[PDB]
Each structure stands twice: as structure tokens, then as C-alpha cells.
Amino acid sequence: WNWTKRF
Amino acid sequence: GSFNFGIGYGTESGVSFQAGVQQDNWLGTGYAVGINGTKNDYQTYAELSVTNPYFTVDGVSLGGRLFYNDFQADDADLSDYTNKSYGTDVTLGFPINEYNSLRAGLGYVHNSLSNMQPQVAMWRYLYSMGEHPSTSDQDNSFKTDDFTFNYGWTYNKLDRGYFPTDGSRVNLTGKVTIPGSDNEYYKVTLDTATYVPIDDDHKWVVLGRTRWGYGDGLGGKEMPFYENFYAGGSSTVRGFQSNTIGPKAVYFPHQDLSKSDDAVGGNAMAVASLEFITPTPFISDKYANSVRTSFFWDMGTVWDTNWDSSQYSGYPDYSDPSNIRMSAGIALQWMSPLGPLVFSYAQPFKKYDGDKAEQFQFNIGKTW
């Protein structure tokens, strides 16, 4: 699984 | 900018982790900055990325890399050795057209070898470099500083990234040492994938993979063993334990020789797969765009072109390329809640001395 969060 | 975490598992990699952070534009420089790291049972890797996609007006990109890598060979089912390395890469990217892109680059790498278990092929390379460590001790060391030119070509006309049904992908990477380097060698790698739909709905597809590797020394040196090719495992020849295909270590005695079943890879490799993609039985059509079944026939060989079967006639000729392993089995891919997933069951119906088997293989991906 890969979590991605645009800061 | 953005940041990301990743957990994965693989039969060959164990539990794996990944993270990274990227600034889309770094203070108006026009170059994106990035820090990325990963870790699994046998590798710890970290890098600093610095790239700009428009170095020229018409698309040419410029990329920088700065990395550290720690590798445990025994954890990767190879004969024991430890390689701690770091280096930098400068790479130019040229899009030739819609389906082709080229890249050229200059690289520096420092390799620090330690904890090497004495064996014939490994020591043979060490002898070619002028290094002659004890053959009864595992407390050794060898360090090199190398500079490389790196070529690259990628063709991609795949109809789709997730679960392709039509088109091909080819990736060719080469590199050669620049004079002044401690090592002297070239190394070439070729990967191909071809998807042929045999039905109008594109549910029934034929997939042909090939993977090739060849490298050898220049000036009487050999290619460093830590640049070897391997075969066997979830991603090459299924049903075979990871990296088991090819030569095995011939160990020197400890404080005459001993044949082993510990793979060491080789400087030449060939892998091919014929895979038949079908609809998934025992699953609804609701879940078709998220699952893929397939039936496959895998084959591959790895050999050591510098193996001297004269000096070591009592053991198998590890320079022989024709001992071609084969397996057949079934595979299942699923875009799961836990991410990309792959089961596979395969029987190695053509194996050889020392080849370790692994019928059931499993992988959860951490990058998507």
C-alpha cells in the first residue's frame, strides 16, 4: 500500500 | 509539494517500508527537490533528488541524484557479502517522440565490500583486481571508486499503465567505466513486455516478457560480482526461490573445496515468459477492472562467462548457458485495499543441482 498527502 | 509512506511485503523482500518528500519547485529555482528512502530484508536505500524537466526550451530534462545504499547478500539469498556504497548521478533526458525517450548520464559510485565469505568466483574477481585476501576468514575488506557513463532508451506504447492489454515496453540501460576508475567493465540490460489482445473486449491477452543481461570486464579485470545478474523469484522465473538460478558458490575451507547450493548470480542472464491473461474465474464481473488472472510459462538462465572449468573440473561448468530452468503456473493480481497485490503458484518442472524451489510467492506493492 502507498499513502500520498500534497502538503 | 507532497510526501508519502509505503508498506509492502514480498516473499523475497520481507516486510518493506518506503517514504519520501518532494518540493514541486524549490524557491523558484525551477528544480524539484526530493528525499526518498526504502528498506527491506536485504537493502537500505536513501537518495536526494534534484530534477528539472525543462532544461532546454524543447523538453530536455536534467536530473541529479545523491544516494546511500546498504546491501546484505545473505539476506538476498546469495553467498554472504556486504556492500555499503554511495555516489551521485547526473542524467540528461531526451524525449525522441511520443513512444521513445533517451537518457545519457555521468555517475560516481564508491563501493565498500566487507564480510565476504571466501568462494571461487568471488575471489577470482578479487584476484583480477590485485586483491588476495585470506581464504579462511570472513573479516575482509575491499574498496573501489568508479566513474561511469550511463546510456538509456525506453520505448513505451502501452495502451494503459495499470493492467496493460495492448502494446509493448522496452527498456535498455548500459554503462561503462570511465578510465581512472578502479574497476574496468561494461554492463547492459534489456527488458521487454509485449501485450497482444486476442479478443475485441481485451479481456484475453497474450503477454511475452524477456529480460537480458550481459557484462564483462575490460583490460583483464572482471565485472564486480556485486554487479551480477540474477534470476528466479516472483518477478523473473516464478516457482524458483529468489536469485537461485545460475552458478553456486564453491567455498574455500574455513579456520579442500565445498560445493554449495548458495546462488551467486553471474555476468550473463536470459529470462523469458509466455503468459496467457484471462478473465478471473470465481469472481464477479463487478471486480474485473481490479483483478487479473493469468497462466504462464517461465524460463531463464544465468551463467559465469569467466568460470574456468579446467581448473575446477570436479564441479559443474558454471560457464555453460544452456541449463535453462523452466516453470509453469497460475497468477492472480488484485488492486486490493492494501494496494497492488500478487499471488502466484508455480511448479519448477525443469530445475538443476542446487536450485531451491518456492511454489507459492506473494507480493504487496508499496509504491502505488
Residue numbers in the entry:
A (entry chain B): 1 to 7
B (entry chain A): 424 to 678, 698 to 810
Question: What did the study's authors say about this model?
Answer:
Among those, the sequence predicted to encode DAR B (W1-N2-W3-T4-K5-R6-F7) particularly caught our attention, since it was a precursor peptide gene that was present in addition to a DAR A-encoding gene within multiple Photorhabdus strains. A similar mode of action could be expected for DAR B, based upon the similar activity data even against DAR A-resistant E. coli strains. To confirm that both compounds compete for the same binding site, we used solution NMR spectroscopy and X-ray crystallography experiments. The high-resolution crystal structure of DAR B, resolved at 2.4 Å, revealed that DAR B binds to the same binding site in E. coli BamA as was identified for DAR A. Thereby, the amino acid side chains of residues T4 and R6 in DAR B are pointed toward the barrel lumen. Furthermore, the binding behavior was also compared in aqueous solution by NMR experiments. The 2D [15N, 1H] transverse relaxation-optimized spectroscopy (TROSY)-HSQC NMR spectra of the transmembrane β-barrel domain of BamA bound to either DAR A or DAR B superimposed essentially perfectly, indicating that the two ligands bind in identical fashion and cause the same structural rearrangements of BamA. Notably, the amino acid composition of the binding site on strand 1 is not conserved between E. coli and A. baumannii, which is in agreement with the backbone-dominated interaction mode and the variability of side chains 4 and 6 between DAR A and B. E. coli strains with an altered bamA sequence showed resistance to both derivatives. DAR B shares a similar spectrum of activity with DAR A, with a 2-fold increase in activity against A. baumannii, which was observed across multiple strains in both wild-type and clinical isolates.
